[PDB]
UniProtKB/Swiss-Prot annotation, chain A:
It comes from Homo sapiens (Human). Keywords: Activator, Diabetes mellitus, Disease variant, DNA-binding, Isopeptide bond, Nucleus, Phosphoprotein, Transcription, Transcription regulation, Ubl conjugation. GO terms for cellular component: chromatin; nucleus. Residues 28-91 form the bZIP domain. Transcription factor that activates insulin gene expression. Acts synergistically with NEUROD1/BETA2 and PDX1. Binds the insulin enhancer C1/RIPE3b element. Binds to consensus TRE-type MARE 5'-TGCTGACTCAGCA-3' DNA sequence. It comes from the Eukaryota. Belongs to the bZIP family. Maf subfamily. The chain holds residues 227 to 318 of 353 of the full protein. The lineage of its organism: Eukaryota, Metazoa, Chordata, Craniata, Vertebrata. Its main location: nucleus. This is Transcription factor MafA.
Swiss-Prot record, chain B:
This is Transcription factor MafA. Transcription factor that activates insulin gene expression. Acts synergistically with NEUROD1/BETA2 and PDX1. Binds the insulin enhancer C1/RIPE3b element. Binds to consensus TRE-type MARE 5'-TGCTGACTCAGCA-3' DNA sequence. Forms homodimers or heterodimers. Monomers and dimers are able to bind DNA, but the off-rate is faster for monomers. Interacts with NEUROD1 and PDX1. May interact with MAFB, FOS, JUN and PCAF. The chain holds residues 226 to 317 of 353 of the full protein. Expressed in the islets of Langerhans (at protein level). The gene is MAFA. It is linked to Insulinomatosis and diabetes mellitus: An autosomal dominant disorder characterized by the occurrence of multicentric insulinomas, hyperinsulinemic hypoglycemia, non insulin-dependent diabetes mellitus, and impaired glucose tolerance. Some patients also exhibit congenital cataract and/or congenital glaucoma. It comes from Homo sapiens (Human).
DNA sequence: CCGGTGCTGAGTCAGCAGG
DNA sequence: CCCTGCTGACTCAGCACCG
């Protein structure tokens, strides 16, 4: 009957408890349940939107940190290649 | 009465002078309508900014991932070159 | 001390995409 | 044909400014 109980019980459990009620009330209670559930759906939707904003802004940092790590790696190899190439061309 | 577009763009000084003579109920009603219409567009901009922000972030992460892909290919090319010269050098 | 403003959280409804 | 879960869009509440 109350909002917390109405939103908690299943429509299967609802129809059984709704037995003995006017057809006017049954459709009225069922639509009250939907409203309360949409309230919860809204909370999840807004929360998800936030989490997705964070994992994007976080992935951006996980990539920037990787890019900088890789630019250092090419600097080591480029220098190391130049070393071998200079030593090689010297021997023709 | 009046239009929505004019009712929103109007300044308070113009709007007040525009309803000199109207009943209190109508004045309050019209004022509430201006607030409602404003809130409608506020939410429109907010969701707009949210979407635009989201698209900016995604494009950055796509550029970064592409950049990482480039660098990964680059170290693979430099390492192969460095090792190739090693073999040619060690021989001669 | 009042009122208009811009913003944003939360609630509502429509309507779409699946159980 | 319902029901579910979700999301866009409107509304209001309430805060933080402002004039």
């Amino acid at each position: 009957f109350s909002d917390d109980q109405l939103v908690s019980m299943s429509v299967r459990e609802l129809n059984r408890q709704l037995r003995g009620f006017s057809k006017e009330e049954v459709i009225r209670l069922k639509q009250k349940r939907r409203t309360l559930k949409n309230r919860g759906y809204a909370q999840s939707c807004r929360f998800k939107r936030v989490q997705q904003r964070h994992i994007l802004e976080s992935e951006k940092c996980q990539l920037q940190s990787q890019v900088e790590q890789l630019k250092l790696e090419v600097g080591r190899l480029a220098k190391e290649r130049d070393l071998y190439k200079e030593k090689y061309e010297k021997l023709a």
